[PDB]
Structure formats: C-alpha cells, structure tokens
Structure 1
C-alpha cells in the first residue's frame, strides 16, 4: 500500500516545475499535506479492508486524492477557518448551547428564498443547527419526499437554484446556525444519469448498481432481507421493464448504489466534496446500514459498511475538516451505536430514546426508558447522540427484545400493543396516529403522525400540551444535540389532505408532514392557546439548556426514583431531572431523596423545592433540580 508522502508527490505532478515550487510552499498545500499525513493512513486502511487487492483501488485512490486537493484548494477561505476551529474543537457537537431544528423548505417556507426569510424566527427560537430535507433534483410526482435523488448538485427547481442554496447557507452561518443536509449515499433515483447509463450498458457506469438477469440471486438474497416498504414490493428487488431485476431496498424508483465497485466510492466522494464546499456543516448519512451487501446476511450493518463510512470520514478530515457526519441508522440498538465514532459518524440519531419516550407515554411505565438511559446512553469521547421526539419518518419500535426480555416483556406482544395504541385501536388511547407499512407476514408495523396528534392535541386532550413538553424536556436535557421537528413547537397537527393526494396516499408518513401553519405560529406568544403554551414551554427549556452549563456534555447517570412512573437522571452531578409519565400525580418519597440537598431550585417551575420531604409531581410534570 502506498504512503502519504508518495501519493502527494504524484498529486503535484500535474504542475510544471515552476508552478510546483509555488504550490509546495503555499498555505493551502501546507495544511492539506499535514492533514494527509495524519489521516491518509486511516483512509488507506479502511479502503484496503474493503477492496483488498482490487486492481482498481490504487488508480481510484490517486484520482480521489487529486480531486480532494483541488477541492480543498477551491474551498472558500471562511470555510477553511471553520475547518481549523472544528479541528481544535471536536466536542462542539457536545455543547449544551446547541439546539437544532429540521424542516422541509417547501412545506415550511415555500422555497429557499422563503426559508431565508425564516432565519429570524430560527434565531428567535434559539436554533444553532438547521437541517433541511432533500433539496436536490428528484423524480416528478413520487420521489419519496426527495429521497430518490436524480442529482446531488442540481437543486430542485421548485425550491430554487444552487445559488439560492449557497445564499441560504451563508445567511445561516451569519445568523450563527450550522447548515445540515442529507447525503443520500446508499441509493439514487432510477432517473439519475448514473442509473440510466448503467442500465443502458454504458461501460463507464458498469456495475454502478446491482442488476440481475432474473430471480435466481434476488430469490437467494430475499431469504434474509428485511422488507422496508413491504407495501411497495416484496424482498429487496424491483424488475425493470426489460425483465432484469435491480436491488431496491426502498421504493422501486430508488436503486442501491454498488459500493463493491471502488469507482462508486470515488464518485460519491466527489459528490461529498461538492456539498462540503457549499459550506454544509453536517451531512445526514442516509441509510448507512445498507451500503454493503453479502449473500446469506441481512445486508445490514456489515463490516465493510462501517469501513466505507470511516473512509468517507477520512476524506473530510483531509479535504474539509469542518464537515461532520450524522448517522440515521434505525436498527437494533447494538447496531445503532456502532456507527457513532469520531472516525466514523461523530453524531447519530438516537432512535432508542425516541421510541421509548413514546413507549413510556403509552404504558406510563419508565422501565424500558430507564434501562436505556442507564445502559445505552453514554458514548465514546468526541461523539454525541442527536435526540429527537419526531422526524419526517414513521416511528419504529426499535428497542431491543433482549433488553425487554430481561424485564419480562415480550418484544413481539409489546409492539402489537404500542402499534394499536398509537393508531387509536386500544380502548382509552389518547393517540391519533395512523399505521405505516403493516406487514402481514411478520406482524411488524410502524406509526405515522405528528407529536401533537400522538399526544391527543387533535381532540383537545387537556394533557396533550404537557405531554409534548415532557417528551421534549428529555431530548433537551439527557445529553446530546436535540433536534426539533419544526411545527412541533406550536402543536401542529397531521396534514388533512395527504390521504386523497394520489402521489401521497400510499405513504402515511405524509400525515405527519404538514405545511407551516400560519394560524398556530401567530399564537405562539398567547399563553391562552395550546400553541403559545407549547412554544413558551419549549422555548423556556431551550433558554435554560443553552444558558446553564449543568447540561453540557452527553453523559448522564440515572437516578432510581422508586416510582415506576417517574424517570430520573443526573447531569454533571448538578442537575437532577424528574419526569412523570403518569396522567396522575406521582410521588418520589423523602426516603428516596435522603442523599440529596435539603432544598433545590427547579429551573422548570422556577420555585424552590424541599427534597427532605415527599416530592409529588403533578401529571406529566417535569422538574430540573439544581443539586449543585
């Protein structure tokens, strides 16, 4: 395997003697060269563990490094300053000062220019991180809400131009907000040029996807493949009009890129560098679990998938240090955490905490949540969870069966309950969600619906507002970067038109992808409305989280409340948080609180509370006690 010093000499071969001498003593090369020596070894190792002795590896690598140099050379000076900062401050993602938001530009602000006008509100809310849903060219009509990419560089016409995007990012950076977008690197739409040329037989795009002549291998593969959208098609393949079959983990119009071909990695790295130079701070690595296939396995979370992501990480450490990765793996908890690492994905969605927040509201029992916060919360250094309550997706019950078993809970039986409960098919349920991808041959089902709809705000449940505040209080204080699904801060309900829109009716997720509700946002400052109650409640928690250093970092120690309905944990040994998931008042006995200070200030209610006496929490009440 070639070394850094060697590959660099060949990178400079494109220059004439006169030019070369000039490049070698330039500041940009000096930085690139230094980063090369520090991170190239990782890049080489990761690529070698995947491609091995593939004859194309070296040629691919050199081509990748050459364009990596050009990319960094072209990279804007301001971004290079952010690179140096991020380099010396890896834990910026762990700061309590960070609070993120996510929205669809079209649904939330109409278009990119319209989004730019929304920045003041984002600052008003306190955001320091803004994630924008798929913004690039995609098939007309059905594109899986933009996740079927037809181009990673041409902005969706309906949203604007690449120019508007560059303006938005700059404006966001001016407002003290990091820009976060998707890097749908596991698949492209079937209309993407690469897909068209590959299927057409263009030798330049040969083996860019997985295409088979018939069902022989697809059938073999399907023996162990999980079905993501069983409603769309069985197994993981879709048939082309010419009779052939292509690997389509998701919708039939989304073709899985073939990373077993090193040229595919190089290509995607090229697209990654493009996004990097737009000034993007964080790339949401979509479906990181599926980027590697192997007959006889689930084709999820395979070793090479982690290796490839770590290779991508190295490229950024070399050509754009400011760019971090956000894992979005919605899989078994043992698998979720493996993607999070300083050299892989620095942050990642915490689906386990999210799913259990909802689980707890339904059962009123914090057992699973407590268990999760006790054994699966803390992460290795320089990494952090992205805690959330809802997102653009359906809710999957990805808690661990093994974990549930230890508690005497049958995973399968429990999901049946959760699913029925949240789709309002369980007596007394306050939830008003809708089913998503019910799978007859497995019994698995997911849930769609906005946070407000799931807590009962649709029927005006008097507990709805407090439920929303309780859930978000957990995501905002457990440790990690909290991501708010914009629209939630004002109690936005499900969309009322999706089911009759022919391009959406077969995907219930659109039920929880409502547009900006002018009426609710106009009430965000009226304490007499649910919108104002929700907004002011969340904003207050946001203000406290960002100003109080006791919430800094991502580590926590759970506190046994001795009340099955109350969750408890401590941040930095100075902040004791209590959360009552019961619709009835619940108590934490004085006996349980004996080791705590006699008195402590509660940042939520702003009152001083005595801990040397029984502490009774009102229904769904949240307390953030400063015990130090």
Structure 2
C-alpha cells in the first residue's frame, strides 16, 4: 500500500513547476498535507480491509485524493475556520448547550426561502441544530418522502435551488445553528442517471448496483434477508421490466448501491465532499447497516459496512474536518452502538431509549427503561447519542429480547401488546396511532402517529400534555444531543388526508408528517391551551438544559427509586432526575432518599423539595433536583 507522502507528490503533478512551488507554500496545502499524514493511514487501512488487492483500489484512491484536495482548496474560508474549531473540540456534540430540531422544508415552511424566514422561531425555541429532510431531486409522486434520490446535486425544484440551500445554510450559521441533512448513500432512485446507465449496460457504470439475471441468487439471499417494507415486496429484490432482478432493500424504486465496487465508494465520497462544501455540519448516514452484502448473512451490520463508514470518516478528517456523521441504525441494541465511534459515526440515533420511552408509557413500568439507561447509555469518549421522542419514521420496538428475557419478559409477546396498545386495540389505551408494515409471516409491526396522537391529545386526554413533557424531559436530560420533531412542541396531531392521497395511502408514516399548524403555533404563548402548555413546558426544559452545566456531557448513573413506576438517574453527580410514568401519584420513600440532601431545588417546578421525607410525584410529574 502507498503512503501519504507519495500520494501527495502525485496530487501536485497537475501543477506546472511554477504553480507547484506556490501551492506547497500555501496555508490550504499545509493544512491538507498535515491532515493527510494524520488520517490517511486510517483511510488506507479501512479501504484495504474491504477491497484488498483489487486492481482498482490504487487508481480509485489517487482519483479520490486528487478530488479531496480540489474540494478542500475550494472550501470556503468560514467553513475552514469551523474545521479548525471542531478539529480541536471533538466534544462539541456532547455540550448541554446543543438542542436540535428536525422538519420537512415543504411541510414546515413551504420552501427554502420560507424556511429561511422561520429561523427567528428556531432561535426563539433555542435550537442550535437543525436537520432538514431530503432536499434533492427525486421521482415525482412516490419517492419515499425524498429518500429515493435522482440527483445529489439538483435541489427539488419545489423547494428552491442549490443557491437557496447555500443561503439557508449560511443564514443558519449566522444564527448559531448547525445545518444537518441526509447522506442517502445506500441507494439511489431507479431514475438516477447512474441507475439508468448501469441497467442500460453502460460500461462506465458496470456493477454500480446489484443486478441479477433471474431469481437464483435473489432466492438464496432472501433466505436470510429482513423485510423492511413487506407491503411493497417480499425479500430484498425487485424485478425490472426486462425480467432481471435488482437489490432493493427498501422501495422498488430505490436501488442499493454496490459498494463492493471501489468506484461506487469514490463516487459517493465525491457527493459527500459536495455536501461538505455546502457548509453542512452533520450528515445523517441513511441506512448505514445495509451498505455491504454477503450471501448467507442478514446483509446488515457486516464488518465491511463499518469499515466503509470509517473510510468515509477519514475522508472528512482530511478534506472537511467540520463534517460529523450521525448514524441512524435502527437495529438490535448491540449493533446500534457499534456504529458510534470517533472514527466512524461520532453521534447516532438512540432508538433504544426512544422505543422504551413509549413502552414505559404503555406499561407504566420503568424496568426496561432503567435497564437500558443503566447498561446501554454511556458511550466511548468523543461520541454522543442523539436522543429523540419521535421522527419522520414509524416506531419500531427495537429493545433486545435477551435484555427483556432477563426481566422475565417475552419479546415477541411484549411487542404484540405494544403494537395493540399504540394503535388503540387494547382496552383503555390512550394512544391513537396507526399500524405500519404489519408482516404476516413474522408477526412484526411498527407504529405511525405523532407524539401528541400517541399520548392521547387527539381526544383531549387530560394527561396528554404531561406525558409529552415527560418524554421530552428524558431525551433532554439523559446526556446526548436531543432532537425535537418540530411540531411536537405545540402538540401537532396526525395528518388526516394521507390515507386518501394516492401517493401516500400505502405508507402510514405520512400520518405523522403533518404540515405546519398555524393555529397551534399561534397559541404557543397562551398558558390556557395545550399548545401553550406544551411549548412553555418544553421551552423551559430547553432553557434549563442549555444554561445549567450539570446537564453537560452524555454520561449518567441510574438511581434505584424502589418504585417500579418512577425512573431515576443522576447527571454529573449534581442533578437527580425523577420521572413518574404512572397516571397515578407515586412515591419515592424517605428511606430511599437517605443519601440525598435534606432539601434540593427542583428546576422543573422551581420549588424547594424536601428529601428527608417521602417524595410523592403527581401523575407523569418530572423533577430535576439539584443535589450538588
């Protein structure tokens, strides 16, 4: 394998002797050169572990590195300052000051210019992180909400132009807000030029996807493949009009890119650099679990998949240090955490905590939640969880069967209950969600519906508002970067047109993808409305989280409350949080609190709480007690 010095000499060969001398003395090159030496070894090692002695590895690497230099050279000065800042502050992601929000530009603000006008609200809310859903060109009609990309360079015309996106990102930076977008690197739409040219037999795009002559291999692969959208098609393949079959983990119009082809890595690395120079701070690595296939395996979380992401990481460490990755692996907890690392994905969605928040509301028992916060919360240094309550996607019950078994709980039976409860098919349920992808051959099913709809706000359940504040309080204080599903802060309900919409009716996730509700937002400052109660409640926790250093970092120590309905944990050995998941008053005995100070200030209610006597929490009450 070649080394950093050798490759750098060849990168400079594109310059005339006179030009070369000038480049080598420039600041840009000095920085690039330094980063090459520091991070190239990792890049080479990761790529070698995946491609081995492939003849195209060296040629691809030099092409990519030449691109990396040009990209860094062109990179805007303001972005390079951010590169330096984060390069010397890897834990910026762990700061309690961070609070993120996510929205669809079209649903929330119409278009990019309209989004730009919403920035003042984002600052009002206190956001320092804004994640925007798929913005680029995609097939008209069904595109899996923009996740079927037909062009990584051209913005969806309905949203604006690439120029408007640049302006938006710069406006967010001016407002002290980081820009976060998806890096849909596991697949493209079947209308993408690469897909068309590959299928057409263009030699320049040979093996860019996984195409087969018949069902021989697809049937073999399907013996071990998990079905993501069983409603759309069985297994992981779709048939082309000409009779061939293509690997399609998700919708039939989404073709899995073939990373076993080094030129695919190079191609996508190029797209990553493009986004990088737009000033994107964080890239949501869509479907990281599926980027490597191997017959006989689930084709999820394979070693090469992890290696490739680490290879991508190195490319950013070299040509755009400010760009961090956000893993979005919704898989077994043991696999989820493997994507999180300083040299892989610095942050990642925490589906375990999210799924258990909802589980606890249904069961009223914090057992599983406590277990998770105790054994699966702390992460390696320089990494953090992205804690959330809801997202653009359905809710999956991704807790570990092995973990549940320890608690005497049958995963299969328990999920059946949860699914029934949240789709209002369980006596007394307050949830008003709808099913998603019920799989008759496995019994699996997921849930769609907004946070407000799932807690009973649709029917005006008197506990609805408190439930919302309770869930968000935990995502906001356990340690990690909290990501609010914009619209939740005012109690937005399900969209009630999706089921009638020809392009959405077969995807219930659209139920929880409502448009900006002018009426609810207009009530955010009115304490007598649910919108106001929710907004002020959440805004206060946001204010406290960001100004109080006791919430800093991502580490926590659980506290045994001795009450199966109350969750408890301590941050920095100075903040004791209690959360009552019961609709009835619940007590934490004075005996249980003997090690605590006689009195402590509750940052939530603002009152002084006595801990030398039984502490009774009202239904769904949350307390953030300063014990130090």
Task: Verify: 1:215 aligned to 2:209, yes or no.
Answer: no
Give the aligned partner of residue 10 of structure 1: 10
RMSD between aligned alpha carbons?
0.2
TM-score for the superposition, normalised by structure 1 = 1.00
Aligned counterpart, 1:377: 377
CA distance in 2, matches of 1:598, 1:371: 28
Runs of 4+ in 1 over 2 A off after TM superposition: none
Paired with 2:210 and 2:535, the residues of 1 have a C-alpha distance of 47
3-state SS in 1 of match to 2:519? helix
Q: Deviations over 1:262-298 (max 9, x none)?
A: 0000000000000000000000000000000000000
Deviation at 1:362, TM superposition (A): 0.1
Inter-partner Cα distance in structure 1 for 2:566 and 2:154: 49
What displacement does 1:157 show? 0.3
Deviation at 1:449, TM superposition (A): 0.1
Aligned pairs, how many? Answer: 628
Kindly provide the CA deviation profile for residues 582-622 of structure 1, in whole angstroms up to 9, marking residues without a partner as x. Answer: 00000000000000011000000000000000000000000
Residue 401 (structure 1) aligns with? 401
Q: Secondary structure at the match of 1:63?
A: helix
Residue segments in structure 2 that go unaligned for 5+ positions in a row? none
Please report how far the alpha carbon of residue 260 of structure 1 lies from its aligned counterpart in structure 2 after TM superposition: 0.1
- CA offset digits 1:183-227 (Å, max 9, x no partner): 000000000000000000000000000000000000000000000
Residue 125 of structure 1 aligns with which residue? 125
For each residue in 1:496-554, what CA deviation from the matched residue of structure 2 results, as whole angstroms up to 9, or x when unmatched?
Answer: 10000000000000000000000000000000000000000000000000000000000
Partners of 1:160 and 1:123 in 2: CA distance:
23
Task: Give the distance between the partners of 1:340 and 1:431, measured in 2 at CA.
Answer: 32
Secondary structure of the equivalent of 2:458?
A: helix
* Aligned position for 1:290: 290
Q: Output the CA distance in 2 between the equivalents of 1:6 and 1:596.
A: 62
CA distance in 1, matches of 2:559, 2:38: 42
Measured after TM superposition, the shift of residue 68 of structure 1 is 0.2
Deviation sequence 1:303-353 (CA, Å, 0-9, x none): 000000000000000000000000000000000000000000000000000
3-state SS of the aligned residue for 1:185? coil
TM-score of the aligned structures, taking structure 2 as reference length: 1.00
Matched position secondary structure for 1:143? coil
Deviation, structure 1 residue 250: 0.2
Q: Distance in 2 between matches of 1:25 and 1:6?
A: 18
Deviations 1:37-70 (A, max 9, x none): 0000000000000000000000000000000000
CA distance in structure 2 between the partners assigned to 1:157 and 1:45 by the alignment: 40
Partners of 2:503 and 2:280 in 1: how far apart?
A: 30
Deviation at 1:445, TM superposition (A): 0.1
- Show structure 1 runs of 5+ residues with no match: none
Deviation of the 1:382 alpha carbon: 0.3
Distance 2:340 2:149 in 1: 25
The residue matched to 1:515 in structure 2 has which SS?
coil
Map Cα deviations across residues 61-116 of structure 1 (whole Å, 9 max, x no partner).
00000000000000000000000000000000000000000000000000000000
SS class of match (1:569):
strand
Aligned to 1:333: 333
Residue 562 of structure 1 deviates from its aligned partner by 0.1
- Aligned residue for 2:521? 521
Deviation at 1:375, TM superposition (A): 0.1
* SS of residue in 2 equivalent to 1:300: coil
> Structure 2 matches for 1:138-537, cutoff 5 A?
138-537=138-537
Superposed CA deviations along residues 107-130 of structure 1, whole A, max 9, x for unmatched, are 000000000000000000000000
Quote the Cα distance in structure 2 between the aligned partners of 1:624 and 1:422.
Answer: 28
Measured in 2, the distance between the counterparts of 1:132 and 1:548 equals 28
Shift of 1:137: 0.1
Deviation, 1:440, is 0.2
CA distance in 2 between partners of 1:366 and 1:139 (Å): 44
Q: Partners in 1 of 2:115 and 2:14 — Cα distance?
A: 42
**Partner secondary structure for residue 457 of structure 1:** coil
Query: Could you tell me how far 1:238 is from its partner in structure 2?
Result: 0.1
Query: What is the CA-CA distance between 1:154 and the residue it aligns to?
Result: 0.4
Q: Equivalent residue of 1:271, what SS?
A: helix
C-alpha displacement of 1:241: 0.2
Write the distance in 1 (CA, Å) between the matches of 2:562 and 2:314: 46
CA distance in structure 2 between the aligned counterparts of 1:154 and 1:369, rounded to whole angstroms:
43
Query: For 2:133 and 2:360, how far apart are their aligned partners in 1?
Result: 29
Q: Aligned-pair distance for 1:488?
A: 0.0
Q: Residue 526 of structure 2 aligns to a residue in which SS?
A: coil
Q: Name the SS of the counterpart of 1:255 in structure 2.
A: strand
State the alpha-carbon separation in 1 of the partners of residues 166 and 78 from structure 2.
Answer: 13
Structure 2 distance, partners of 1:248, 1:16, is 47
Q: Deviation of residue 181 (structure 1)?
A: 0.2
Q: Deviations over 1:542-575 (max 9, x none)?
A: 0000000000000000000000000000000000
> Deviation at 1:233?
0.1
